[PDB]
Amino acid sequence: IRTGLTDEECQEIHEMNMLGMHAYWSIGLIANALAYAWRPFHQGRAGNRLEDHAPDYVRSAL
Amino acid sequence: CERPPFEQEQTGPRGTGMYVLDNPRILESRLDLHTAPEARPMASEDGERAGDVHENVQVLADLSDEQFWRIKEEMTDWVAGDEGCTYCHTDDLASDEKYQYRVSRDMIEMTRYLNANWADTHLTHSNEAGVTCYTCHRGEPIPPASWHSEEESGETRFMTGMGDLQLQNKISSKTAYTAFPRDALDTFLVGHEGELSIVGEGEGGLRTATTEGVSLREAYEAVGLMMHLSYSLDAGCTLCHNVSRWASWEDSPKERETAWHGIRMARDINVNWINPLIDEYPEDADVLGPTGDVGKVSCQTCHNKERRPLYGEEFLELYPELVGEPDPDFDYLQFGDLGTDLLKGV
Amino acid sequence: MWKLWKFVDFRMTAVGFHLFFALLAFAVHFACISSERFNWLEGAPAAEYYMDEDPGIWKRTSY
Amino acid sequence: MWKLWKFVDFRMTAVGFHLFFALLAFAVHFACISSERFNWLEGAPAAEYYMDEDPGIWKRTSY
Amino acid sequence: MEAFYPMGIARFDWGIWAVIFFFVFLAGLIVYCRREDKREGYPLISDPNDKYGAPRLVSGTIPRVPKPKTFLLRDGRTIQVPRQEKVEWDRNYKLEAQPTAPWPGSPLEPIGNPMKAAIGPGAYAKREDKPELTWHNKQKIVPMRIATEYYVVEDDPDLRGAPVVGLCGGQGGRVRDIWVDRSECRIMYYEVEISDSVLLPQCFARETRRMDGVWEIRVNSITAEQFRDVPRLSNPDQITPQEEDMVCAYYGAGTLYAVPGRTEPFLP
Amino acid sequence: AMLDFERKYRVRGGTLLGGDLFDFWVGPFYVGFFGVTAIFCAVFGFLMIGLKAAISETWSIFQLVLAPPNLENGFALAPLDEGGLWQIVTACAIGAFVSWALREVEISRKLGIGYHIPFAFGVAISFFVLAQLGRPLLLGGWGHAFPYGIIAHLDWVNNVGYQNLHYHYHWAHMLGCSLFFATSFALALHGGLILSVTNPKKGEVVKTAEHENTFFRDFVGYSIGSLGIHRLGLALALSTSISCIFGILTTGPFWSRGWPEWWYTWWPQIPIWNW
Amino acid sequence: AEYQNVFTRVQVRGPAEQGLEVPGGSWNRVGRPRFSYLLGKIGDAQVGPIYLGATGVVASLGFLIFCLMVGFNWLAAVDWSVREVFRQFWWLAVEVPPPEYGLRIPPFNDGGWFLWGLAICSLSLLMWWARTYIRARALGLGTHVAWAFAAALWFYFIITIIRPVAIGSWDESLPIGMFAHLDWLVAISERYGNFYYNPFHMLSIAFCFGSALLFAAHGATILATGRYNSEREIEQITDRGTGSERAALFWRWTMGFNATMESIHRWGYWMAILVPLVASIGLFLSGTVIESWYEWGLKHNLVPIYEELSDPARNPAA
Ligand code: A1LZM
Ligand code: A1LZM
Ligand SMILES: C/C=C1/c2cc3[nH]c4c(c3C)C(=O)[C@H](C(=O)OC)c4c3nc(cc4[nH]c(cc(n2)[C@@H]1C)c(C(C)=O)c4C)[C@@H](C)[C@@H]3CCC(=O)OC/C=C(/C)CCC[C@H](C)CC/C=C(\C)CCCC(C)C
Ligand code: HEC
Ligand code: HEC
Ligand code: HEC
Ligand SMILES: [Fe+3]
């Protein structure tokens, strides 16, 4: 149903919405890039399980 | 749906709710399962020893020939099922080619041990019953109530995946169809580190600075084992407890005490007699459980939904050849309670 | 489908589609998590790491 | 889509996105904790610490 | 009587101390609820039927009667509970009854016809004499002849014109119209014309389908003749809370006084 | 000692049994013959409870119990020291509950209100009667009925529940616990709604039935209404008492195994998913 | 007999009432109001419209996410067989972390999924509570319903989070399963003595049994006095009528004391919301202060002592 908002009210709402959405989006992209550089989220074909690469004495929760 | 009347046994003070209702029609329907076969006539001890008239006789060597044949025929009637003598025997009767032969040798040793050592504390509570081959097997090669480790304790765990019930939350007769931990039989009737005294004590009923109890998970496991106990004896918790005070032995019916020994006895049976059989079994035997384990003995293995196995039929005097000599260093407290001296290998 | 909003409420359509796609994104991520091959949090190896050839999908390979 | 606020209540949309992102931040952080590789609270080693080659993500590595 | 650090000493533990604290809170909560109970009918009044005077200090004060609660209303009125018009109504209520015995706690036997006495089950409270409105200032309790937007659902009998029978089965009247509550969307009253029109509370009316397939209203409370004595409406098309309360009280009077037997026990 | 409006209703008549002899008030209480008999049964039963406290040397409301006879006693009259006091107090409690409900019938007649309150109380009384008679009849003796102790009847509930291993899984227990939880849930909702309508923030006017209807329509999509909430509440509480009847009459009499095993007996084998 | 006010034999329908004006109501009220005749037998027939608020929508979404997490875990537990899920519907659960983690969030399949779902469910319940509060406030109502839900949610957080944290172990928390959370009941009561001996358990059962008592008695009272329009209780509170008078006099002549039309709802509100509150107190003390309720009540002369058994069981472990 119609919200009753004028074009200018919708445009200021959308200005704020674009600001919030894209600022959160860019901050999250930077955060995910930092966490990915810390530890890449997606394993290679070899995987990244400690049991497959670490020595036997390195305990793995897996 | 069940129906009155019931055989009632008031196990505690009046009005406490401490009684057990047993369905007479259900016991009548399980009468074939719960009655041992008619015993063979007693065999004379006078005669040539079975180890002298037979090449490969070691466990029954000290038996007379007639006692040997009596016990062989009874074991055939108790474990062989419809396979008969060929169940454990090849064409050569002195050859242990079949694992059933050597397993039955160890089983004769175990039955002798049970009748010699567990009769005073557990196997002769109401009657001089003891156990025979039929007590667990009930005429079949595999005891119907033999249990294996659940096919979740042996599987590889997907630790970061989905759908791990943690040995709980599944239908199992091992927990009397509760969602309680299904590996309680391993924890208590095989393992000895498990704590069954889960009810808090504290000091004044309070978590004092010195008070250390069990975790809630340990309570889950113990209550699951207790569900198994109740399932096996076809009775409720009131058979051995004023549930209002589980830790109170003085308020518990005598059947708790013998049940205690049964727990340890099961551990004994599983640790010193059942598990070491895995060497005798073939590596890919279909009899072995999903985890590649031999079927262990639980409460239900002898208590096939019955308060006393085989209606408490007496076998100690009836089968002296299944009663061995008492273990000189037998101690029911050395099965994980005062120590682990009598649990060989652990 | 531009006339659908003459008869179908775009409010409920959009809200329910966003709610359902949140639920479905969670569902699909759960399906990936439950899969050993696809759980990135577990980080299990791909079987292709050990195959000497391309398995394909429709490749009609033979043992 | 500045015209979406002619038909979708922006107050609901913004507040609901904030609520769902609180819920999703908890969900995702808990997912990371539930992963050994990504549990910074437990601080397990990375398999890259013990690998002599870069595993890659799309790199067609073979055993 | 050992100390139980950090959980107390002897029985002075925090199981019992949280128990004591919660019983203290529960006692305070019961006291609060009792004070809220004392917002109507309090302060208590002794029985006037008494050979002795009234004690200066009256009962019902152990949880104090709270300060009267202020309710702001939609119509802009600020009412104070207990509402003093109701209290003065009770003070000046015409009894048409005498105590059976000269002691307090004696029941009141009505002097004459108890249907018209408005005593006991026929007693009614003082209520507003202005018809109640909904949030949109619409007549809350309205006949369906005025609120044409309200209709009896298809699956249910529309008893406009249906016979209304009394306790003894006599024809009390016919349903001229149905009064509905706009806010509650329920039938409040059946307007029953008598061959004049009275109102019949919905809970005093049993819509019974006769084996003829004809629906009727069975009124167990009063008889067909007594339908002529139901309190009429000051305005035919509207009912005030006072008139609702009067009509309901008349039928409640009938529940005990419609016939001589229903006020008497099985075995006296 | 009498409400501001009470005298206006304090009329003679409405008695089921008692005539005008017992038709009076003592303070706030209406008496009636059923009030006389209710006081008789209540005080005599409490005096028998005190007699058990004396003979058992248990002067503690918590530790004192009148337990029914032993199971071997059957339906026989027991010695007062062996369950006879429990039998006397069972008769006293049945009589007191019935007399209380009948006094409430008298009060309802005198006030011209429906008999819904004594009916609901009679549903609770029916639970008590079927628990203390129906369970003995099903199981063959007074010893299967629960005892009369503040804490000890909790021990009986414990032991009778654990007789079927895991009593939570009882179907009647599951339904009745759901019904008690729904009853407390609905009482919380209903008290909260009425107080919210009549006690908004300070300075706000008292709201209406439209307000509460639209509150639950906005909240959960459905508003049951003023009449509907009380009908549902009477139904929920009554139905939980009937569920209690079924639970106490089925655990043991109609299932002597574990309720977990009861659930396993049918639910996993339902052929639509047993394959 | 007289009309018992049990069912509405004749239902009347007006125009479908969208609801009283609230901020955002025109947009957020969704669903064409549907009239259930079966629901109209008891109460209002109208179903809908529902408020599609931010808190309500996201709380429902989080509840759905939680339910789907539970369902996916059940599927993966039964090898993704919906048939086996339904076969074992009551047994299956998302199990809590084992004690060896303590308060650590474990891997998903070692109780981490339980903590994940606990976070999702707790946040969704808090958003639903916020919806309760805001829906009450938007209509100019008191937040009593929100605070009753707050009492229930406080008990829920004690069960799931606060008390497991105070004990220091997540295995004390409530498993997400039909039979599993009943097994949690058994395990908690028997591990910590016996909740039958827990006086807050006693009081919470007193308040639950008394919620049933008060709400049976109050529904019966209102249905009995519906002859005098007592079901319209708001009017009976602001404009006390003969129905409220008769209800009060019934209960005064029965018990010696009565309530008002408003104070009976105060009584019922508090009797209900006391169940989760004193429940939370007793559960929290179980495992933090109290190790055995049986031993504690033995010290307090609360636990009955029964006839000494002939031939008691003697602990073989001394
Ligand atoms: C181990 C074991 C166990 C158990 C046991 C069991 C058994 C045997 C049984 C039961 C029951 C149940 N429960 Mg239980 N439990 C558990 C638990 C639980 C839970 C959780 C949480 O967990 C929950 C929630 C639950 C609840 C329930 C519910 C439902 C129910 C109850 C209620 C009743 O009944 O009351 C009912 C009751 C009634 C009605 C009552 C009535 C009065 C009368 C007239 C009135 C008058 C009186 C008087 C005295 C006067 C006063 C004066 C003034 C004061 C002046 N659960 C565990 C498990 N379980 C029942 C049944 O079934 O139902 C269904 C039975 O039987
Ligand atoms: C270890 C750890 C970790 C993490 C962590 C965290 C925390 C703690 C948190 C987070 C988040 C968040 N994220 Mg992340 N991560 C992770 C991963 C990820 C992923 C994947 C792929 O994997 C994704 C896609 C994400 C995403 C996101 C968002 C959606 C949110 C928001 C932010 C933003 O905005 O950004 C922004 C955005 C973004 C980043 C995104 C975008 C598109 C892109 C370009 C593309 C896509 C692709 C795909 C999907 C496929 C590939 C894969 C394969 C297999 C190769 N994350 C890891 C695993 N987190 C948050 C939340 O939730 O909020 C509420 C939080 O709190
Ligand atoms: C589904 C509906 C329900 C419902 C409905 C409802 N209950 C009502 C009314 C309505 C409509 C009333 O109208 C009536 C009333 O006046 O108060 C509001 C009443 C009442 N119920 C009471 C207690 C109550 N009720 C409970 C359950 C429900 N009550 C279910 C949930 C529960 C429990 C355990 O759940 C309790 C303890 C009293 C307060 C009051 C009766 C007084 C009496 O009997 O007088 C008689 C007066 C006395 C003093 C009785 C004494 C009689 C013997 C000799 C004393 C010994 C007592 C026993 C042997 C009982 C067993 C003891 C246990 C420890 C094992
Ligand atoms: C498994 C449970 C067996 C069944 C069934 C039967 N027999 Fe057996 N038999 C079994 C064992 C383990 C042994 C060795 C006994 C010992 O003390 O070591 C035997 C022994 C015999 C022998 C003597 C072997 C020899 O040295 O010749 C014979 C002759 C024999 N058994 C015969 C026999 C018959 C005829 C059976 C069927 C009725 C039968 N056995 C059943 C194990 C098992
Ligand atoms: C209970 C304590 C037992 C008694 C007494 C006896 N047996 Fe047994 N036996 C028992 C178990 C639990 C098992 C394992 C079953 C399983 O699931 O694998 C066995 C096994 C055997 C076997 C081998 C069964 C097979 O794989 O075919 C044999 C041949 C056997 N037992 C023989 C046997 C005999 C001869 C006994 C009496 C002297 C005897 N058993 C006693 C449990 C118990
Ligand atoms: C076979 C080797 C058994 C196992 C394993 C368990 N029990 Fe047993 N139990 C067994 C016998 C032969 C007997 C004697 C029966 C008799 O009539 O004397 C018992 C006895 C009990 C009893 C006492 C029963 C009674 O007479 O009242 C109880 C309570 C009991 N057993 C419990 C019990 C439990 C709890 C067990 C598992 C932990 C258990 N038993 C194992 C044989 C065997
Ligand atoms: Fe109400």
Side-chain angles (χ1 to χ4, degrees), chain E residues 95-98 100 107-123 167 220-223 226 249-264, chain F residues 7-14 23 25 109-112, chain G residues 246 253:
Chain E
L95 293 170
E96 301 292 325
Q98 314 185 344
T100 61
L108 298 161
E109 157 84 351
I111 50 176
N113 173 226
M115 292 302 294
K116 290 184 178 181
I119 198 62
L167 167 71
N220 179 63
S221 51
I222 73 163
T223 74
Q226 292 174 354
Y250 178 84
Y251 287 90
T255 69
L256 194 65
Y257 298 126
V259 291
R262 55 173 57 248
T263 191
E264 313 291 345
Chain F
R7 182 168 180 260
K8 188 172 70 177
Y9 300 79
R10 271 207 191 175
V11 290
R12 76 152 304 279
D23 177 27
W25 286 259
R109 300 224 312 127
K110 194 183 293 299
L111 283 156
Chain G
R246 280 153 213 253
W253 300 347

Side-chain angles (χ1 to χ4, degrees), chain B residues 243, chain F residues 46 97 121 123-128 135 156-162 165-170 172-178 180-181 240-251, chain G residues 182 185-186 190 196 201 208-209 213:
Chain B
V243 306
Chain F
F46 274 119
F97 303 161
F121 184 39
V123 171
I125 301 158
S126 75
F127 163 79
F128 175 70
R135 179 159 174 101
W156 179 96
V157 179
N158 212 2
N159 278 284
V160 168
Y162 273 126
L165 276 59
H166 199 138
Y167 198 79
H168 288 97
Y169 294 174
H170 188 356
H173 203 240
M174 278 157 70
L175 172 73
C177 299
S178 307
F180 271 108
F181 289 157
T240 195
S241 180
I242 296 89
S243 68
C244 299
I245 285 148
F246 279 114
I248 201 157
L249 287 191
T250 50
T251 178
Chain G
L182 308 183
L185 297 176
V186 165
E190 311 315 329
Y196 281 131
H201 192 232
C208 195
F209 283 177
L213 186 157

Side-chain angles (χ1 to χ4, degrees), chain E residues 70-73, chain F residues 198-207, chain G residues 136-137 139-142:
Chain E
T70 288
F71 285 127
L72 311 172
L73 307 189
Chain F
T198 57
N199 311 273
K201 290 176 73 174
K202 187 264 183 181
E204 305 209 69
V205 311
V206 175
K207 294 318 183 287
Chain G
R137 284 307 199 223
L139 277 159
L141 303 167

